[PDB]
Structures are given as C-alpha cells and as structure tokens.
Amino acid sequence: GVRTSPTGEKVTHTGQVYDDEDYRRVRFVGRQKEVNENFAIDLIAEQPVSQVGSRVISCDGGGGALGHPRVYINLDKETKTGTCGYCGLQFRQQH
Amino acid sequence: SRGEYVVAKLDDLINWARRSSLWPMTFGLACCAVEMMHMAAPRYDMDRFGVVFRASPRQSDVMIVAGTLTNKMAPALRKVYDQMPEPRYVVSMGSCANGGGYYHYSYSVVRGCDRIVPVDIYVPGCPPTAEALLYGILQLQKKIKREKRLRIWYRR
Amino acid sequence: TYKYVNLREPSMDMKSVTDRAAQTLLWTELIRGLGMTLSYLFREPATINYPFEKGPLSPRFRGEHALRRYPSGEERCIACKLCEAVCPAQAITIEAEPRADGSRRTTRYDIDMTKCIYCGFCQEACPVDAIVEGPNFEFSTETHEELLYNKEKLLNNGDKWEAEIAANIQADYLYR
Amino acid sequence: LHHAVIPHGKGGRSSVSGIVATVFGATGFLGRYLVNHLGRMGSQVIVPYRCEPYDTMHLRPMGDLGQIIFMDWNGRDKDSIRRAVEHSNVVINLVGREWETKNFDFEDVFVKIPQAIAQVSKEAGVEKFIHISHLNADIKSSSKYLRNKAVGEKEVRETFPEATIIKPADIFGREDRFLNYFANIRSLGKKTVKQPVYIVDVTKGIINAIKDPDARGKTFAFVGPNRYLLFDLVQYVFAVAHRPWTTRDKVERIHTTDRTLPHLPGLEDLGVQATPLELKAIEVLRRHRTVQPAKTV
Amino acid sequence: TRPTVRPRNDVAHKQLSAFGEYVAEILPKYVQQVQVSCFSELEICIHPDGVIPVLTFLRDHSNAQFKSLADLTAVDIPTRQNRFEIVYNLLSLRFNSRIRVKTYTDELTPVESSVSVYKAANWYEREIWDMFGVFFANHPDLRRILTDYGFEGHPFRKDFPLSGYVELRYDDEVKRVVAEPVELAQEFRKFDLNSPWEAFPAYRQPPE
Amino acid sequence: PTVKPPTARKFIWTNHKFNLSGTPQQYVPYSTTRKKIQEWVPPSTPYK
Amino acid sequence: FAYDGLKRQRLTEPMVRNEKGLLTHTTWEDALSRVAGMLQSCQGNDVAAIAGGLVDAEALIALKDLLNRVDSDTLCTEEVFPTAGAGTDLRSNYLLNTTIAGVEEADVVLLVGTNPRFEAPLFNARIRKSWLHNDLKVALIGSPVD
Amino acid sequence: TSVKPIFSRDMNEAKRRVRELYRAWYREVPNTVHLFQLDISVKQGRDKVREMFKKNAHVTDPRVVDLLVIKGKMELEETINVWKQRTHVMRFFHETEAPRPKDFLSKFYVGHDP
Amino acid sequence: SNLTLNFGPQGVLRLVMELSGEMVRKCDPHIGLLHRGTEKLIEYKTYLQALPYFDRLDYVSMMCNEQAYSLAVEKLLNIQPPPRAQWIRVLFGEITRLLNHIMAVTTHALDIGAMTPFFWMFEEREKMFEFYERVSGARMHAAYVRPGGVHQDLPLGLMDDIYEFSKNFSLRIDELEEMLTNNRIWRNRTVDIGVVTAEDALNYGFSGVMLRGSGIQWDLRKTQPYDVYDQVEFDVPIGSRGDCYDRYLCRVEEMRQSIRIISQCLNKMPPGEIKVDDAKVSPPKRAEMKTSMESLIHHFKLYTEGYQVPPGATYTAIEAPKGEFGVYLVSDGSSRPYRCKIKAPGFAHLAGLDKMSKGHMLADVVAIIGTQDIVFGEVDR
Numbered sequence A: 001g002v003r004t005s006p007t008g009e010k011v012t013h014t015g016q017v018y019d020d021e022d023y024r025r026v027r028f029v030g031r032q033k034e035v036n037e038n039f040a041i042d043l044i045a046e047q048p049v050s051q052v053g054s055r056v057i058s059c060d061g062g063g064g065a066l067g068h069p070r071v072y073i074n075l076d077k078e079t080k081t082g083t084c085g086y087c088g089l090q091f092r093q094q095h
Numbered sequence B: 001s002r003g004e005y006v007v008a009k010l011d012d013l014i015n016w017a018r019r020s021s022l023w024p025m026t027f028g029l030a031c032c033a034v035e036m037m038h039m040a041a042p043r044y045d046m047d048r049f050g051v052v053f054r055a056s057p058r059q060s061d062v063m064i065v066a067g068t069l070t071n072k073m074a075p076a077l078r079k080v081y082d083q084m085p086e087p088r089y090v091v092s093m094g095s096c097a098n099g100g101g102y103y104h105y106s107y108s109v110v111r112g113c114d115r116i117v118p119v120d121i122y123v124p125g126c127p128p129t130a131e132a133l134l135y136g137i138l139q140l141q142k143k144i145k146r147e148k149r150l151r152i153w154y155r156r
Numbered sequence C: 001t002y003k004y005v006n007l008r009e010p011s012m013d014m015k016s017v018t019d020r021a022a023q024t025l026l027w028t029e030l031i032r033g034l035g036m037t038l039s040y041l042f043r044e045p046a047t048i049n050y051p052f053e054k055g056p057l058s059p060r061f062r063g064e065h066a067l068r069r070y071p072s073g074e075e076r077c078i079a080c081k082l083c084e085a086v087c088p089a090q091a092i093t094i095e096a097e098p099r100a101d102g103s104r105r106t107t108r109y110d111i112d113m114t115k116c117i118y119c120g121f122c123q124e125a126c127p128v129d130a131i132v133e134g135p136n137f138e139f140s141t142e143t144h145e146e147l148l149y150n151k152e153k154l155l156n157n158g159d160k161w162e163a164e165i166a167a168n169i170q171a172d173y174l175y176r
Numbered sequence D: 001l002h003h004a005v006i007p008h009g010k011g012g013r014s015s016v017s018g019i020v021a022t023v024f025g026a027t028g029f030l031g032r033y034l035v036n037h038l039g040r041m042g043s044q045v046i047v048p049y050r051c052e053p054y055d056t057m058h059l060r061p062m063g064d065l066g067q068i069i070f071m072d073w074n075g076r077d078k079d080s081i082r083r084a085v086e087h088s089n090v091v092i093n094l095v096g097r098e099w100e101t102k103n104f105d106f107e108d109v110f111v112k113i114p115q116a117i118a119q120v121s122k123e124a125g126v127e128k129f130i131h132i133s134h135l136n137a138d139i140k141s142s143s144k145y146l147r148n149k150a151v152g153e154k155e156v157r158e159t160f161p162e163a164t165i166i167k168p169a170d171i172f173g174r175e176d177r178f179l180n181y182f183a184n185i186r187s188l189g190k191k192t193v194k195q196p197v198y199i200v201d202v203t204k205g206i207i208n209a210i211k212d213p214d215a216r217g218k219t220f221a222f223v224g225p226n227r228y229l230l231f232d233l234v235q236y237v238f239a240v241a242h243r244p245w246t247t248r249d250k251v252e253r254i255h256t257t258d259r260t261l262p263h264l265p266g267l268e269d270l271g272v273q274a275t276p277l278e279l280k281a282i283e284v285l286r287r288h289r290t291v292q293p294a295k296t297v
Numbered sequence E: 001t002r003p004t005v006r007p008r009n010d011v012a013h014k015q016l017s018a019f020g021e022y023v024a025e026i027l028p029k030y031v032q033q034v035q036v037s038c039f040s041e042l043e044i045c046i047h048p049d050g051v052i053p054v055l056t057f058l059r060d061h062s063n064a065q066f067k068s069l070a071d072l073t074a075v076d077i078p079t080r081q082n083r084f085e086i087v088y089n090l091l092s093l094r095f096n097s098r099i100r101v102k103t104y105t106d107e108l109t110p111v112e113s114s115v116s117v118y119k120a121a122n123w124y125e126r127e128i129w130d131m132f133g134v135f136f137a138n139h140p141d142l143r144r145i146l147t148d149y150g151f152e153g154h155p156f157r158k159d160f161p162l163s164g165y166v167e168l169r170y171d172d173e174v175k176r177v178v179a180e181p182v183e184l185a186q187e188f189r190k191f192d193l194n195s196p197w198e199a200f201p202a203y204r205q206p207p208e
Numbered sequence F: 001p002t003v004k005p006p007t008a009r010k011f012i013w014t015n016h017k018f019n020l021s022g023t024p025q026q027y028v029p030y031s032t033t034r035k036k037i038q039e040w041v042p043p044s045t046p047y048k
Numbered sequence G: 001f002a003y004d005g006l007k008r009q010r011l012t013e014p015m016v017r018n019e020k021g022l023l024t025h026t027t028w029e030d031a032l033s034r035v036a037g038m039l040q041s042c043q044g045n046d047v048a049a050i051a052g053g054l055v056d057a058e059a060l061i062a063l064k065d066l067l068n069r070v071d072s073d074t075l076c077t078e079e080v081f082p083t084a085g086a087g088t089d090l091r092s093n094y095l096l097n098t099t100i101a102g103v104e105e106a107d108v109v110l111l112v113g114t115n116p117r118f119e120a121p122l123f124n125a126r127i128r129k130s131w132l133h134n135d136l137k138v139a140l141i142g143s144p145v146d
Numbered sequence H: 001t002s003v004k005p006i007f008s009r010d011m012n013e014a015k016r017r018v019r020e021l022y023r024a025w026y027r028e029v030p031n032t033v034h035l036f037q038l039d040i041s042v043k044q045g046r047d048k049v050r051e052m053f054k055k056n057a058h059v060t061d062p063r064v065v066d067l068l069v070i071k072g073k074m075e076l077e078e079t080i081n082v083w084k085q086r087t088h089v090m091r092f093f094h095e096t097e098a099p100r101p102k103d104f105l106s107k108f109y110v111g112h113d114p
Numbered sequence I: 001s002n003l004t005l006n007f008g009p010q011g012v013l014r015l016v017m018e019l020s021g022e023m024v025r026k027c028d029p030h031i032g033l034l035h036r037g038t039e040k041l042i043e044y045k046t047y048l049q050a051l052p053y054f055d056r057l058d059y060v061s062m063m064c065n066e067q068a069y070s071l072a073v074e075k076l077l078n079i080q081p082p083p084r085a086q087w088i089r090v091l092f093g094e095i096t097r098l099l100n101h102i103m104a105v106t107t108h109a110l111d112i113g114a115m116t117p118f119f120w121m122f123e124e125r126e127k128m129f130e131f132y133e134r135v136s137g138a139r140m141h142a143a144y145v146r147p148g149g150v151h152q153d154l155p156l157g158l159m160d161d162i163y164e165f166s167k168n169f170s171l172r173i174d175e176l177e178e179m180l181t182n183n184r185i186w187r188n189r190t191v192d193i194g195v196v197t198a199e200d201a202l203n204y205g206f207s208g209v210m211l212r213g214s215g216i217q218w219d220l221r222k223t224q225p226y227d228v229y230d231q232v233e234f235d236v237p238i239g240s241r242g243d244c245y246d247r248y249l250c251r252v253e254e255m256r257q258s259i260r261i262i263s264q265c266l267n268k269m270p271p272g273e274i275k276v277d278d279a280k281v282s283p284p285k286r287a288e289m290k291t292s293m294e295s296l297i298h299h300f301k302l303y304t305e306g307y308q309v310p311p312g313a314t315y316t317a318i319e320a321p322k323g324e325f326g327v328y329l330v331s332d333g334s335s336r337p338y339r340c341k342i343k344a345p346g347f348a349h350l351a352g353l354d355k356m357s358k359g360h361m362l363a364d365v366v367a368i369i370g371t372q373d374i375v376f377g378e379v380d381r
C-alpha cells in the first residue's frame, strides 16, 4: 500500500521520502526510485485471526525447520489477540 | 535526412567491429585471474566471441582489472591504462576491484579500482564465476553497441 | 613408501642406443605430440553456447542476495543483526525500530555488494531464513553505486527470485 | 539552510562540502579541472553532457560515490536545463566553442545558451550563478567570438543580476589551446601584448567565487602576473618545446592584445596567488619535446 | 572424553620436556624459560643476546639437528616494556620435531640477524622490519618488502590503525596517483564481543 | 516448471524483468531511514 | 530516558533577525560579527549574562573572562542562592558538605524545605539505604511529600 | 637505563651520520628532479629535504636518530635505484591537499577539529 | 659495466635484473604488489570470520589453507573433528592438490610456450570446481573446512561423480605427460635449470617438492601426519637432480598419488556427523536451532561472539601442494585471534629465487619462477 509525497516521490514501507528542498532527489532525476509495492504491514493485516481451543498456542511459521524458532503464546486475554513475535500471525482462544 | 542515415549505418558498422573484436588486457592481480582463465578455458571460451586470449597492452581494447588493487600497484595500473589506445574500456571484476571487498578497511588496498581508472562494467562476486565474467563482457559489448559517436558528431 | 622419479639408467646395448638415435634423428616423440594434438582436433569440444547454454550449478550456489517473506507477505527479517555481526566483510548495515503495529522490523538493511565476499555466513546465521544468497550471478552493473543494495532492492530481489529460492531451500535444508 | 547540505568532515573526498554545483560544459578544458577541484571537497556535482558518455569517463574518478550525476541536455531546450538546475545551489556556465559549426554559431553558443541557463536558473531558485566570459570581449571587436561573448555577458548580467562574471585572459594548461596552439603551428609576431592565466588559478578563483558571498554581482578579471609581447611569448614557447585545423577568428584573437582592466578585481582578491608561466610552461610543454625566460612589458 | 576431545600425546610431551631440560642445561647463559604446551609443543624463551648461539646450537648439535627454519615471526604486546616478541619456528627432519625459540626487543634495541645461521631469514626478519620496526643488525639487505615505497610507519604494530593514515587516488590535475588523509565512506565498526563471564578457570590470573 | 511448478505466492512477480543497468529503470541507492535530529523551527511571529 | 529530547528541537544553525524580526539562518561570521558589534559598544553594566542549568565550567569561565574584558560583573545564574553573609566566598555554605556517601555514616538527618525524591533521586536512594541498613532517623520540615 | 646501541655511541657520531645522509640527499636531488622529470625546481626539492631533516631536529636520543638515519638511507636507496615512481617522490609535496586551517577562527568555522 | 633491467608489473611481480649479457648475475624480486594486510585484518575478526581469509592466500589451494587454519584452531581448542569430516577433509585436500598441480604444470608450460595442455587440463579443473560448488556453493573460495569439521554434509550423488572423475583423470595425466615429459624441447628448457642442493634447500626454508626434487625424503603427510593420512596408502615421489624437470615429474607423480588417495577415500568414507558434537564450538543444526533453547543460545553466541579459544600459541603446519603451509596462531583467551602469522612456502621459495637463477639466462628465469609454484597472494599476504 504505497503512498506519494507532494513532490511525486514515492513513500517507502519505512515512511522515507526526501524533502521538497532536498538536493538528494537529483539521483532520481532521469532514473527511478526503486520501492517495493508489497508492504508487509499491510499484507499481515489481511491474515485471519486463528481461532484455537487451547490456552497456550505454538507457532513455528509453517514448514517446521523452514520457519522461525517455535514460540509459545499465551491466550488469556480475551481483549487482545496473541501475536507471534516472529511472523506476525495472531491467535485467539475461541471461548 | 540522408546524412543522419549514413552516420547511423556507419555507427552500426564501427560499433559492430569494435564489440565483435574486443582484445582484453587482463590484470592478473589475485584470485579473479583464475576465473578469467576459466573464462578462457574450453568450456566458456572467450575466443569464440572474438575476445582473444592475452593480447598486449598497447593494442588491447579493454582492461580487465581482476583482483585486489593495492597501493603499491595503483600507479602501475594507471600507467598501463594510459598506454592503452582509445577506445579503451575497463571492466572491474570481483569485490576487491569493485570496492575493496574483503580488504576494504585495509591500510594497503585501493578501495575500488574506480579511484584510479574510469570503470565501464562492474562484475560482482568473490570471485564472480567465469560465466558471470562472460556476462559482464557481453554487457560491455552491448554498451559498445549503443554508442553514438558519429551521430553526435553529425549533430555537433 | 617413496618412489624415485627420474632414476632410470638407459641401456647400452646396440639395440637401445640405436633406438635413442632413431628417436633423435627421426623426431619420434615430436610426432607423438603431434598425434596427441591431432587426436584432440577430432574430438567434440567442451564449449557450451553461452548465453543460450548455461554452466551446471547446484542448489547450494551463492549468488545475489535477497530478502524472503513468509507465505503471508510478512517479511522474515526481525532485525536481530546476527547477519551483520557475522559478516566477515562488514558489508551489511542494519538499523531498526518498532513499526506501527509493534513488530521488530528494520528500517535500514543495506548490503554493499562490492564489499561482500559472497561466503553466505549471513544466510546460515539467519535464524528465520530471511536473508538468502540466491541463484542470480548475472547482475553486473555499469555503475559502482548500483552494487550498493538497500532494503528495497533486496526485497525486490526476494519478490523476483522467491519461486527459485524456496525450491533451492527445499532441496537443501536437510543438509543444514 | 537544509540539513543535508551542511558541510561536514575534513574537506576530503568523502566529506560533505555543501556545494550542489551544475557545471554546464564540464566535458571541456575548464570543466575538467573544475569538477576535479569540486569533487575533492565532496561536492554534489551535476554534469549535463551533450557528447557520448564515453567522453565523460574521465569525470568519473573525480568524486566519491554518487557525487557526480551525469545527465543529458540540449542547449536549445530549457526543459533539460530546468531538469539539471532544479536541485543546485550553484550553476557554473562553461559552454563555449573556438569555432562556429553548422548547427551552432557564436550566437547560438555565447548568447542564447547562457541567457537560457541563467534565466531558467533564475526561475528555479538557484542562489549562485557563474558566467565565464573573455577578457577581450567587446561589442565593436574585430572577432565574432568576442562580440557575441560581450553580448552574452550583457544578457547574463541583465537576466541574473547577482551573477558572478569571470574574465580569464588566455588560459594555459595541459589540455589548453594556447601553448599547444603555439607549439604545433610551426602565427607571426606583432605588437600584441598578452598576459596568460594558469588553469589551476582559474579553478581556484571559480571555487573561491562559489564560496564567497561578497562575490555575488561582481565582475572579476583573471589575469596572470606577467604581460608578454606576442612574438617573444611564441619564441619562448618554441624555446621550451625545443623547436626552431584553424580559423581566421583564432588569428584575430591571438593578435588582439589583452586589455588592462584595473577597475575589475582579480585573483588577488579571491585569495589566489597567480602562478607565472615560467613555473608551469615546462609542465605544459614537456609533451612536445622529441631556457631564457621571456621579457615582460 | 573419547569422541569430541583431542587426545593427549604423553610420549611426545615427556620427550619434549626431557629435551627442554637438555637445552636449558647445555645453554644456561641465555635460556630464561622452557615450557611445553598441553598439545605438546616446546618453547625455549631466551635472551636477545643469544640469538646466534642458540640457533646455531639447534641447527648443528647432533641430538637437535633443527636444520629447517619454518617461520620467523614478531608479536606486538604493548603492555610489556619489551613489546616485540620474536618467534623462531624450527624443524628437525632427523628427529621429526619442531621447536619454538622466543626472544624479545623494544623499538630501539636491535636484534642480531640470523642470516648467518638460516639464510631463509633474509626475507623473514626483513618482513619484521617492514611490519614492526624491529631493526636487525648485520643484515645484508634490510629494507621494506611488503608495504609501498613511501609508506611511513609500521603496520602490524598494535598502536597502528586498521586503515592507514593515507589513501591513494588518481588526481587529474597533477596527472598522478596521490596520497591524501584517509576518509572512509563508512567507518569500520568496532564490535565489543568479549563475554564478561570467565571461560577458562585454568588460565585464571591471581588478583592483586 | 511445466512438470514441477513453483509454489505460487501473492507477492512473487508475475512479470520477470531482465538486467536494467544502463536504462532509466536502473536501481539508484538511497538511505531508507528518516531524519534523525529534528531542528528547531523558529516561530513566524516577530519578537515584540 | 531523556536522551530522545537530545534529538528533538535542537538548535543546529546560527540565527539572526531579518527585517521582519524573524529568526533566519546565517553563517558564523555574520552571527559573531553582529554579536561583537554590540559587545564593542557596551561597557560596565551595559552587558550582562545568565547561565542555565546545563552549562559546563569551561564555557562559564570563557564568558566570565569575555565579560570581564568589557568590565562587566553582572554574571548571573537562574537558581537563586542568598548572598547575605559569606555568600559564595567560602565553599562550605553551598555544598553537600558531608557527602552523598556520608549519609551512610549519619544517624539523624534533618531535611529542610526540600523534596529530595524529585530533586536528587539518588541522594534520596542513599538516604533510604541508610534508613534501612543503619536505622537512620529522618525528619522533614516542609510539605508532607512521599 | 643502559641500552644497547645501534650504530652510534653518543650524539656526535649520530650527527656525523645525519650530516653524511644530508650530504647524500643534497647530491641526489638534482638527479631526482632530472630522471623523474619532476616539475619542481632543484632548490625546492632541497628545501623539502631541509624541511624533512629539520622536522626531526628535536630528538636527543642516539638510537632514535640512528633509526632515522637508517630510514633516510632506505628512502635514498629507493630514490637512487629507480624503485619509487614519480608519485612516490611527489608524495612529499602535498600538492592536491587543501590548505589546513591554522588559526583558531577558521578551525572554528570549518568544523570541530582542534 | 653490466646491464640492469626492470621487468615491471606491466599474480604480479617486479624484477630487478643485473645481467652480464645473456647471463643473470643478480635477481631482485620486488614484491608487496598484493600485500593487503590480511594478518592484521584477522586480528579484528573472530575465528569463523578469519577463516575466509585463508581461502584467498593460496587462491589455487583453497581448502588446504582452510584445513591448516582449522587444524590450528582445533589444536588450540583441544577438540577433534568426527572421522567422516576427517575423511572429507583429506578427500577435498587431495582434490585441491590436483587443482594446484594442474595450475602449476599447465601455467609452467604456458609461460615456456606449451599453451595447449593448459586448455586440456582446465576442463578437468572446471569439473573439480563443480565439485567445490556442489559441496559448498562457491567454485573457488568455499569457506567449507571449519574448526570442528566441515560446514555441511556431502550432497547425495557427489561421491559417484568424484568416482567418475577419478576413473578418467589418469588418462588426462597421461596425455599431459605425453605432450611434455619425453618432449625434447620441454627437457631442454628444464633439465639444466635451477639445480638446488639438498643442504641449501634445507637452509633456505624450502618445503614440499622444492625439497623432494633434491632427494630429501620429507612429506608432512607421512612424517607429521594429520587427519587420516596415516590411514591412506600412497607413495612420495623423490627427485634425483634438484632441477625443474624433476620437480615437474614430482608434481605429475603427486597427481598420480592424489588419484590413489581419492580412490581410497571414496572407498573408505565412514558414516556419521560432520561437525564436532560440541555445540559450544560448532553450530547446531538448523532444525534444532529452531526447537531447542540451548541450541538457539549457542547459535546466537557462535554467530555473534564466536567460541572463546584458550590462550596459547601454536604453529600448525600441513602439506599444502606448494609445501609446508603453516599458521602461527596466538590466542589471548577471547573469541578473536591476538596474532596470526601465515607461513607460506612461496615466500621462502621466492627468497631462494636469487640463488636458483645464478649463472642462468633471462629465459630461464621464467622457468625458475615456474618451478617454484609462486602464487603471490600467499607470498605477500
């Protein structure tokens, strides 16, 4: 989910864009500013909250040894989802 | 116009003759020389592209800097570059020639051969494979293909 | 347990002396060398037709760097800075901060490809398989600063090359 | 002042100098040493080029990474000039020809191109503009060079009122066309008086005019420390170089004497000691080798 | 401790201890220490006046016969008043053995050149001049061998920075490779990697 | 890949691109972080 | 945790007043010339000086030597200390004379008019360590702060 | 405080060695300007040799000036024998370097360096 | 008077010749043209980080120098590799020996003028670089042999291809030897050239073929054996005259005996792990890094800090194809070396170049620089 400064220069997933009066835009004159158009903070918000029937859930990011270190998430808060600290996936106890 | 067409065909002819007959002068500085020798070896075989094996510096078309450029040899690099007739080209090969590489923070290493000579093609790797060096040489040939010396001369 | 190369005495009967003189006057071993070179004339050469034919590689090959994503679009890198800690060239520069959803992510992930020694300690130090040294070796540039990759270039390398990187990691991760 | 343009470092190669310079005509004799001396401070130099990019290769070792930005430009197109000056804080104009071509005469080069560069840099918010004219520029001059160059000087002064105009007399260096023109001509001697200025002094003067805020709107005259007659100058060039393409305009400009302008400041007001010919003419003319110094006025 | 632990060779340990006693009692004029490491390597720490008498002994004595000079090394240790530690690695082919001969100097005391004993040293200690600044007296051709010709300083001294003080670049004004003060586009990032917990209690030094 | 196709993702490029060095679509490096030290913006009113 | 104010609202460039009375950016030559032109016209009590809370001793004695060259003794701080009597002539009547560590040796502490929790928090922590381990008797004259 | 000497026993033998080294450099400078075809005058190279000798004039230790004479001999050997190029000879003349600020005020203007 | 030439840098080498017409009176090799300050950069980097510098010293003998540094660090750590890692190290060390002797013989023939067996044997060298790329991912600088064993196990089907290579490689040695050994022009360029006596070879610090060409029966794989060289069966070629021709024959026979060793290592490869099973030195598997807490802590601390090596000094020398390659490693107790002197054979050989080229001619200097296999990366560090 890219956005654009009033200079026409694209805004990265960090939020970086050069200022209007900054000379360092001259490196993009006649060339392109290479930004990635798949913002991970937008792509992780599209994932469904996984409803599980346990109090403690585990996540390994999928794949087993192809994912991240396996972590355990407590699901005692019904107010809030329990987000995996590595992959950003989030869980909820269904009761 | 007619003269624009004539100088366009003449640019195409002289660019064909200069890219299809590149003669390299290879600086065998370090480990990248071994992979240049594999690019000359029978598998990848530079000679079938018109790229001859070990021409002399006073008639070569491209200086391949292949290996670490130390402080002790940077004037020798610039001197051999100055002895080359024009059009001369420089291919930087591997990380030490490109930016200093694994010896970037060394006291006795020139941090990239583009502090010494003007570099046309940067081939990255440690060492870049002989197939990757050959990719860089073909990209040099494509850069020679889109030169516009006589078109700009007719327009100047 | 040792052998003497070049400790043969030549014979001194008239047969072997005439053999050595025939070898001198009739150039027999020079004809042997001509015969070996003539033998290679009538062989198929080892030359592949690059760019249309490619040299054979393995799934372990260490080419151009890329940053991978999970199969949800979330990037794998969680700013732990093991890859710039182990980088023998100090080619990696990382800066991080928590982003808007609280995730531990990088704002700067730079790899100076001209400093890089392409040894792949960053992919084997990475605990989440984020940075990989993928299959691409044909990425020569015409300018020095084009070989100074920021995070956007490496994420575009991951998006460009993920279909091949994931298959190489699938073929190789049981040896790791 | 913006934060990215504050000078940092020790003034070396990888430092920041705060100069964002657009040097028009950097692929020539003065642009060579100007981009050299700007790049050793750590300046963001923008080089617009008309020629083949191969003829820009020697400008590439002159700075750090990303410091020289090459871009295309047409001298009749204001759009590419605006594309090249819209980030610069100083615009130097070094566009010139010793001869007229079929596509560009002296009026196309000395009048229309500097007026276009100065006007577009005026409407782009550029602080500093530098125009390079000739010391012998005059409206009623004998050579079309000096006539159109005086007209271009007047136009630059009336379209960029804070422009620094610089008058070098006849510049000598390694890639010049003053001592090398004399050494290869194998025209005569007349009553012509010349004081030649050295190219590193011209470059130091251009940079000290970039850095000085009191040089805005001034007109400088860059002249050497010794005036020579034409005949014994040419004989001293043949004496150093060990010897016994042209136009009529170059002959009109060799036999035109270098005028004395005391009312215009010079290299001594920009902190530049003028280097005499007797120290650097050997460095210029050692190439032409297969000595009594020249008498002044 | 069978699979993963390197096995101790007590035979070579006892033999090198006996030969260290032997060298310490034949040459008490110079031998200051004799030590044998846990992986069975012998070090003879001598006085710098006895470089030529010790090295000619081990080269020529029929129980030693250390004919080969494997390596010659200096080590910079700035916490000593004799900061440089000159290391001679010697190989006996008759007795299939290696010995280390270690001496010391500061910046200004010269060490006697061992080119009379082993001609191999003709470059090695020459390298020690280029890298450390240790002068070697009565050397035939002592000059720099590895650094550039106009290089000031000695690089392998530990008070010398990782980069130099000067860097080279081609300058087009003077048409020449020139030296300028070093300025990095990115600083070498010093990492503080030492763990604050003691790793080896065997090497624990007693406090004050 | 006709026999064993790669595992498809929503982020993998549907349009592969070749080496773009020497073109206007080439990569240009830049700092991907924001401004660190904030400056004092002086107030727009006079001091009287 | 106050180090992130060290990277906000910072004065990074010299500023002078323009014709509109607005602070505008300038170089060091212009700013120091416009200050020294006013310092050369002052003498006596025409020029004064106030030091803040975060000022080092080197700049304090720099400005004191500079304002003594103009013969100006009006050198002030913001935190008001009474000059009645000895004033600042003797160092004893404006120091923590015992020490911070000397609270460990004390048995009775009288805290007058102060809230040492938020004025000097580690001095309060040392008082609590003496209170806990040495059974210090603490009396406070002032508002009943915690 | 008794040290082993290098070549000299006191300061006078060391000044003898400094004097002969300066004589050898003074004789060498015209040949150095000639065969390297340097752009400097012979007087300017001799002033540089005088500057490089007077840079170390404060040393009152015989071993230190012994090593200085030895290093000047090595530089002279690299100059007579054409081992140095033109660049190595001209590195004594710091030409392309900017003039460093000398007073307090310009060093205050350009940065933080004392 | 007599002639003085400067064969300059137009690896790389500067040569100052004092000639007396055709003869050579003095040969001064000016080196340092590839001095990069490797063994100062080692001092600021950890042991794992200092490992890839050893690939780039003798850049035609990569895994040999990896093996020598790994043996030095494992000696200071008082740990040993598993047996399978030892057989893999000896296997790839002899493949590296084939690489280096092909480079040596074919460039020594290329400089003299026989330019054809260069092209014939670099296809075999291309196949061995494919073996390196299959085992590690890079064709030359593998960073594969590490302290503790090797980095990663052999991929399946690699040993069958090493078999198919080794079965055919003796015919390649035979056709090289057909082109050069009985060739009268090759013999006239190498027989009377650079005769080195055995006493001067021991005195000059020569090692390897430079000793064994002169009849000295010394090979460090026999006398001071390392990983499993006491368990393989091979012969050591010995010269008779100390010249360029005997050193050529010694290198051809060392290719023969390396093929013998590679056949024995293919037939005797044991099962098991490839790192030391101390996870405080060699890193754990990635499957157990992502499951175990101790293994994640050890992964973190090995790839950021590294293992602490106990304080001590060692000189570990192996038999690289150029000779005795030594590492004098000094550890101060931290996870970075205090000192790492790199002894390489080409330094002492190029020091002896001046004696070896006395009384010879100018075109014999290139033969003597060929018979000492001089890679200037290992000479200048």
Ligand SMILES: CCCCCCCCCCCCCCCCCC(=O)OC[C@H](COP(=O)(O)OCCN)OC(=O)CCCCCCCCCCCCCCCCC
Binding pocket: B006, B009, B010, B012, B013, B016
């Ligand atoms: C007024 C109008 C006329 C003006 C004057 C011109 C007269 C004719 C002159 C000759 C022809 C001019 C045009 C030259 C070719 C232009 C197009 C071109 O460059 O095509 C490229 C093509 C090869 O494509 P490439 O990019 O190499 O692809 C590699 C594949 N893997 O290339 C090819 O397929 C082959 C290219 C061959 C080029 C022509 C042959 C060489 C010239 C012969 C005549 C001159 C020399 C005579 C002999 C000299 C002495 C021996």
Ligand SMILES: NC(=O)C1=CN([C@@H]2O[C@H](COP(=O)(O)OP(=O)(O)OC[C@H]3O[C@@H](n4cnc5c(N)ncnc54)[C@H](OP(=O)(O)O)[C@@H]3O)[C@@H](O)[C@H]2O)C=CC1
Binding pocket: B156, D024, D025, D026, D027, D028, D029, D030, D031, D050, D051, D075, D093, D094, D095, D096, D097, D098, D104, D108, D109, D132, D133, D134, D135, D167, D168, D169, D170, D171, D172, D177, D178
């Ligand atoms: N003796 C001297 O050197 C003196 C020079 N001057 C003035 O100083 C300036 C620079 O001098 P100098 O270096 O010698 O001149 P050069 O001819 O060497 O350089 C001129 C530069 O301008 C470019 N240029 C020329 N004509 C045009 C055009 N029509 N459109 C676009 N670009 C063009 C050239 O590029 P390209 O390569 O494409 O042609 C080149 O980069 C000139 O204005 C000259 O009149 C003043 C006094 C003395």
Ligand code: SF4
Binding pocket: B030, B031, B032, B033, B066, B067, B068, B093, B094, B095, B096, B097, B101, B102, B125, B126, B127, B128, I056, I059, I141
């Ligand atoms: S980039 Fe690396 S592999 Fe290549 S020559 Fe340099 S050190 Fe050797």
Ligand code: SF4
Binding pocket: C083, C086, C087, C088, C089, C090, C091, C092, C111, C115, C116, C117, C118, C119, C120, C121, C122, C123, C133
């Ligand atoms: S491959 Fe090696 S040098 Fe390159 S970024 Fe990764 S760890 Fe650093």
Ligand code: SF4
Binding pocket: C076, C077, C078, C079, C080, C081, C082, C083, C084, C094, C122, C125, C126, C127, C128, C129, C130, C131
């Ligand atoms: S790429 Fe991997 S190792 Fe590097 S900071 Fe990101 S998660 Fe850590």
Ligand SMILES: [Zn+2]
Binding pocket: A059, A060, A061, A068, A084, A085, A086, A087, A088, A089
């Ligand atoms: Zn997860």
